[PDB]
Structure 1
Amino acid sequence: DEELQTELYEIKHQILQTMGVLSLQGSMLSVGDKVFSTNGQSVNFDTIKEMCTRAGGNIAVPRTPEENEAIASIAKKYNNYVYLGMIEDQTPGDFHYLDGASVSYTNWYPGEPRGQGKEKCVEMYTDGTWNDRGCLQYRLAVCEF
């Protein structure tokens, strides 16, 4: 319908406005079709997953250098490491996304991972590099939508 087109125009405009306000005020970061945001809290891995899922999203995980840089900027902004959305396989050294798929893009800090299976989780340093670590530390909660 000619009216359907105009209705969609207004809808898209309003979305742009709301997303623009959130972006301008630093409430969220947009990279491609992914949106990253934090509540500023520092809690453990399980708690982060819960906070994100409750908000309708998921604990963040970078799959491209650009996405990695975005999360890194948030970690730097709050000066704290960030737990990423991935866990170690049965075979130490190998990690998978929470959906089970094997991790593709990686940005390990030189020498990592080397937890020998004792560090199932992955944290991001403020410079963007990763380190396998235990899952009970308090880390900045960053979600992706």
Structure 2
Amino acid sequence: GFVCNTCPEKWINFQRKCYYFGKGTKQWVHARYACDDMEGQLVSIHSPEEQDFLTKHASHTGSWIGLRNLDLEFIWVDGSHVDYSNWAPGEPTSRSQGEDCVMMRGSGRWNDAFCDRKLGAWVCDRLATCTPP
């Protein structure tokens, strides 16, 4: 096994991951289950290179991402902590209470909005399968 760029039908390869750029009106939790029932998760961005690819295919309206708030601290759906951050200027707002779910704007910048908000786009990500040369 050396080459990891093997994608299922309708998924787009980037680096060592597969991405599905889903459409249709969905609440954060609804988009959380849309990927889980597809054998994927809501997207976890960890590199500027990943973000740049994501921005290129993402809908201008705004896509849900796998980041959310708790208590403590923002953590991705995979459980990973935030290392790379592409927050919009002045984000995350530490006064807007209830805005615990993160979305990604057309520009790629992330905004933290209400979980009950209906967005037209949502991005999923899974691991890319391998091939032995």
Tell whether the structures are fold-level matches, with TM greater than 0.5.
Answer: yes
1:141 maps to 2:122: yes
1:68 maps to 2:57: no
In 2: Cα distance, 1:108 partner to 1:79 partner: 16
Aligned pair count reads 123
Deviation at 1:31, TM superposition (A): 1.6
**In structure 2, what is the equivalent of residue 101 of structure 1?**
80
Please state whether the residue corresponding to 1:47 is helix, strand or coil: helix
Give the conservation status (yes or no) of the 8 Å contact 2:60–2:107: no
Deviation at 1:74, TM superposition (A): 2.4
Please state whether the residue corresponding to 1:79 is helix, strand or coil: coil
Cα-Cα RMSD: 2.5
Give the conservation status (yes or no) of the 8 Å contact 2:41–2:77: no
In 2: Cα distance, 1:62 partner to 1:99 partner: 11
- Which structure has more relative contact order (CA 8 Å, sep 6+)? It is 2
In 2: Cα distance, 1:67 partner to 1:37 partner: 14
Would you tell me which structure has more strand in proportion to its own residues?
A: 2
TM-score of the superposed pair, with normalisation by structure 2? 0.78
The runs of 5 or more residues in structure 1 that have no matched partner are 1-7
In 2: Cα distance, 1:42 partner to 1:64 partner: 28
Instruction: Give the counterpart of 2:62 among 75, 81, 85.
Output: 81
In 2: Cα distance, 1:29 partner to 1:102 partner: 25
Give the conservation status (yes or no) of the 8 Å contact 2:42–2:65: yes
